[PDB]
Curated annotation (Swiss-Prot):
Protein name: Protein BRASSINOSTEROID INSENSITIVE 1
Function noted in UniProt: Receptor with a dual specificity kinase activity acting on both serine/threonine- and tyrosine-containing substrates. Regulates, in response to brassinosteroid binding, a signaling cascade involved in plant development, including expression of light- and stress-regulated genes, promotion of cell elongation, normal leaf and chloroplast senescence, and flowering. Binds brassinolide (BL), and less effectively castasterone (CS), but not 2,3,22,23-O-tetramethylbrassinolide or ecdysone. May be involved in a feedback regulation of brassinosteroid biosynthesis.
Effect of inactivating the gene: Dwarf phenotype and aberrant leaf shape.
Expressed in which tissues: Expressed ubiquitously.
Additional comment: Binding of brassinosteroid induces intramolecular autophosphorylation of BRI1. Interaction with BAK1 activates both receptor kinases and the full activation of either receptor kinase requires transphosphorylation by their partners. Homodimerizes in the absence of ligand and binds brassinosteroid in the absence of its coreceptor BAK1. The bri1-9 mutation produces a fully active protein with a subtle conformational change that is recognized for reglucosylation by UGGT, resulting in its endoplasmic reticulum retention via Glc(1)Man(9)GlcNAc(2)-calreticulin/calnexin interaction.
Domain comment quoted from the record: Contains one leucine-zipper motif and two pairs of conservatively spaced Cys (Cys pair 1 and 2) involved in forming heterodimers. A 70 amino acid island between the 21st and the 22th LRR is essential for the binding of brassinosteroids.
Effect of substituting residue 176 to A: Abolishes peptide phosphorylation, and autophosphorylation
Chain coiled-coil ranges: none
Maturation and modification: Phosphorylated on at least 12 sites, with a preference for Ser residues. Glycosylated.
Outcome, altering residue 171 to A: Abolishes peptide phosphorylation, and to a lower level autophosphorylation
Length: 284
């Protein structure tokens, strides 16, 4: 499954001249269209914004990361269009959209057994990025809106527009600007222009809180750490306890994973491999 170079004309007609009816997300980072290629492929087409600046760097960021690897828990980049001032990226369509859209209902009710699979799945995706890839890949924008869900509701990490490569001989990578989303930014990212895999782990933690709490990050991490000083049986998603109050024991342990990821000290945070190992220790 090689990275296809798609003609701009194909993408143009597949979206009916980039018509509004095909649009499923715009502005901010990229314009996204739901489309069917002339071979019948169900895809998502991102039309990049502000080329020859933030846009072109974003393009190469994805091309050099997600575009050169494949993994069960990473949204596959199927193709690209680099023509003139136009930058487009083509992905496999994710049926049930983003985790954020689902946790913040317009939808599909997520029971705990599926939420924990989403957590394990997303965790495995980042683990692959941090440990299996050389150079390592720092995502730098892990969040619920960048966790997509296929037909099987398995998590697939998306949006490598701000991702960067780091040698395995380095603990951190020094950047040019502060990247991330409010509510997800690692506290140490505010103190210096440096990013790291531990930074990704922090951001992952927030997502794990969203799955546990059911709340938006906007902070969530703050009073959770403060209610951790009080009674922990007060923060979990109400709809989770309705299913069975017996699974509250693994919830707390899963909460113990989330809080470790969210430590202000980057050195104290677990690696995503340790996170995976911790997830495995809970059920079996």
């Amino acid at each position: 499954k090689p990275l296809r170079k798609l003609a701009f004309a194909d993408l143009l007609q597949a979206t009916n001249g980039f018509h509004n009816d095909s649009l499923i997300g715009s502005g901010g980072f990229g314009d996204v269209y739901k489309a069917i290629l002339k071979d019948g492929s169900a895809v998502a087409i991102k039309k990049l914004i502000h080329v020859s600046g933030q846009g072109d760097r974003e393009f190469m960021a994805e091309m050099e990361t997600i575009g050169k690897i494949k993994h069960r828990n990473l949204v596959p980049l199927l193709g690209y269009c680099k023509v003139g001032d136009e930058r487009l990226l083509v992905y496999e369509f994710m049926k049930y959209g983003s985790l954020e859209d689902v946790l913040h209902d317009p939808g599909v009710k997520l029971n705990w057994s599926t939420r924990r699979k989403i957590a394990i799945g997303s965790a495995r995706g980042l683990a692959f990025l941090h440990h299996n890839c050389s150079p390592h890949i720092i995502h730098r924008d892990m969040k619920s809106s960048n966790v997509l869900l296929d037909e099987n509701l398995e998590a697939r990490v998306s949006d490598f527009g701000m991702a960067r490569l780091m040698s395995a001989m380095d603990t951190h990578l020094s950047v040019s600007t502060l990247a991330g989303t409010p509510g997800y930014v690692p506290p140490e990212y505010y103190q210096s222009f440096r990013c790291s895999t531990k930074g990704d782990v922090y951001s992952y933690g927030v997502v794990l809180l969203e799955l546990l709490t059911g709340k938006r990050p906007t902070n969530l991490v703050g009073w959770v750490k403060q209610h951790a000083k009080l009674r922990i049986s007060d923060v979990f998603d109400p709809e989770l306890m309705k299913e069975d109050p017996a699974l509250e024991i693994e919830l707390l342990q899963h909460l113990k994973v989330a809080v470790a990821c969210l430590d202000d000290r980057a050195w104290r945070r677990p690696t995503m491999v340790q996170v995976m190992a911790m997830f495995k220790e809970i059920q079996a």
